[PDB]
């Protein structure tokens, strides 16, 4: 499995980053957001066979769309909220809800990263860069 | 023959699942519906040379369209009600009748999966996922 | 030569079947029509190098378009009435007449199978199915 | 050579046949026309490297266009009247004359085989059939 | 170098032929025209690396367009009047008239062969035929 | 990493050149512009795996887009202002402003080289030329 | 590097030729124009890795577009006036000026060869001919 950083092409310096909770980057449920690119383990990801982006912070930590559209790392499972696919420079969630929309990895406000409905996603360009 | 789970792309966690009958998942005539994905034997399927989806629950259990459009596993024979083919993420039965329509594998409410006329099949996206 | 059943995709369970004459499935001139699929010898066919569909019921029994468009098995010869080719799931006869049309293998009601002018052949999907 | 019968696809049973003349089928200048297919040597042909159809009745007997569109077998030479090429199921002569047309092997009426101007050749389908 | 005859497809029996001068086919400046095909050396040609058609009559005898558009065999040189190329069954000279006219090998009457402006080359089909 | 000069195809003799500061071509912050091509160290560049153009003048000197679109060499980092990619003879910056504008390496008068919005870039052809 | 003559396809016998100055074909600044083709060293050329056409008359002599659009041989350098590329039978200079046009190697009357704006280049067909 190929390990990558996920760098925004919509901001001159922002990578997808596991913040964690209270200093601990390895915890299940740890927050994921944007940070300046440095390429440490908490900015490294790998796309597995089940379309999940696994973080290098620890075993069994997958990138997860939450109900309020924020991102965390969680135990890896079958839910579409953990499945991701690329179309060009767009990184798209398989998450479904009642809105009839695809949700895209997106910077919404300043440097805050979440998923955003396709028709609203103004800063949604990304590049997977081999580590 | 590749063994797959049949996971919905229209529901965040539903796989095609042999419920069985009377607690026994191996029984001829057992019911098929949807369930949280766990990838056990009663959620593993293989498409054979005759376009039948064989369940891994036991020998000679093929996914079958019933007269009322519910699904079961039955002994494998020649009927078109046991034949399936893919078009993109749609899984289509070869079953024919007088209603000028193709029937698609479709979630019809809750954890219930049946086949539904094409023009009405709104929860009908699937991904055959190798195991 | 691949041995196949010829199964309908226009009927939930129908295979091209040599009925024969008076119980004998092997006779020249025997009727061919539809039946539930079972894969026994009178439902097995082979497409030969002359584009004929040879039946397994006996030597020298080829699927034949008759003048009235019904199907029988007959001694194998050169006639276009015995020549068949595929386009997708359509099985087409090389038979010619004065009506400017191709004739397709077609279910014409119940278990009756005949050939039908292309533009009117509405139950005419088939799958040559490798014998199991 | 690939030895073939030349069977019509415009008639339920007609092959290109050396009739001959005097009952002798080997004679130069012998007539060629249509007959029910039987694959004896007077219906077997081989296309040589100079695009001539050589009959198996005897040595040096090529299929030849005459100016009145009738067909014979004649000694083999360089004339375009003896050169043939395929376009799909059409068998076309290289013969030229003042009528600015390509001539196609064709059943003119009944069982009468000649060559015919392309725009008039309505029974001109053939299958070169391996012996 | 493939030795060929150059047979017309516009005439039922005509090959490009070195007439010579007074019975001698090998003479420099010898006339070139058409004849019935027999494939002797004065009808055999080979296309060389400089796009010249060399006659098999004798060494250093190239098919040459003259200013008056007649054909001869001459010593081999660099002039475009000795260069030839095929487009389909057309055999085209690289000769420049200053007109932007392409001159095609063409039968101009009886057994006379010359090159002719493309727009009016009415008998200019050829087949290079392996010997 | 292949080492190249970046020679303009929009000016008869201009190469991308580190001017440096006070004759010192090695300084961080040194200006980059155009000069006649000579291929000394301050005209040699290498594209690295992070898509940065590293100058040969000294270690850790990457070609950098500034906020006013002028070019310098700076310490190498992760910022898009230092990332470049080719499309034919165009060398495109990943630098982001608000406008969705792509900025191209472009001559903007005399020997002045900067990045210019794609629609305006009239002298933006370049050839990466092996040393 | 393949040694070629550059022969016109727009004139029946013209090759690109180093005239030199005063009988010396070797001198820097020597004139280049058209001549009957003979393939001596002053008509032999080689396209190098920098897209320069080097002449065989002497070392370090490249075909050079001058400001007045005449051609000479000069010491080999980086200028686009010495760079050449092929598009079909067109030999195109990389020379740029005020006019937004490509300049093509072109016969401009008699044996005068120059570069001409593409739109007006009507004797500009060439064949690089292996020696």
């Amino acid at each position: 499995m190929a390990h990558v950083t996920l760098q925004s092409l919509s901001n001159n310096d922002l990578c997808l980053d596991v913040y964690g909770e209270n200093g601990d980057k390895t915890v299940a449920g740890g927050s994921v957001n944007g940070w300046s690119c440095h390429g440490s383990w908490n900015q490294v990801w790998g796309l597995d066979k089940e379309e999940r982006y696994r973080s290098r912070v620890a075993s069994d930590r997958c990138l997860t769309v939450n109900a309020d559209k924020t991102l965390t790392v969680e135990q890896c499972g079958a839910n579409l909220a953990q499945k991701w696919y690329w179309e060009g420079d767009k990184l798209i969630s398989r998450y479904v809800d009642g809105n009839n929309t695809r949700y895209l990895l997106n910077i919404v406000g300043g440097r805050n990263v979440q998923v955003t409905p396709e028709n609203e996603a103004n800063q949604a360009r990304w590049k997977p860069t081999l580590q």
Side-chain angles (χ1 to χ4, degrees), chain A residues 95-99 101-103 117-119:
Chain A
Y95 175 81
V96 308
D97 62 15
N99 288 109
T101 185
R102 304 200 294 176
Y103 290 89
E118 188 162 17
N119 288 333

Side-chain angles (χ1 to χ4, degrees), chain A residues 65-99 101-128:
Chain A
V65 175
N66 291 241
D68 64 1
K69 310 303 178 297
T70 59
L71 302 159
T72 56
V73 285
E74 315 282 349
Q75 293 184 322
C76 303
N79 199 283
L80 298 188
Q82 295 186 330
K83 296 197 185 309
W84 301 91
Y85 64 102
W86 292 93
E87 297 189 350
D89 58 18
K90 303 313 184 306
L91 181 51
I92 305 181
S93 175
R94 296 214 182 266
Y95 175 81
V96 308
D97 62 15
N99 288 109
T101 185
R102 304 200 294 176
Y103 290 89
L104 276 53
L105 191 68
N106 189 52
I107 307 169
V108 294
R111 298 177 61 81
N112 278 305
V113 185
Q114 49 188 221
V115 297
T116 301
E118 188 162 17
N119 288 333
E120 296 173 5
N122 291 351
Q123 294 176 272
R125 300 175 62 206
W126 303 84
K127 180 168 197 268

Side-chain angles (χ1 to χ4, degrees), chain A residues 50-55 57-68:
Chain A
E50 311 305 311
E51 299 189 288
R52 302 172 294 205
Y53 260 121
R54 292 176 171 262
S55 171
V57 293
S59 297
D60 199 30
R61 295 293 181 269
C62 288
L63 185 65
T64 309
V65 175
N66 291 241
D68 64 1

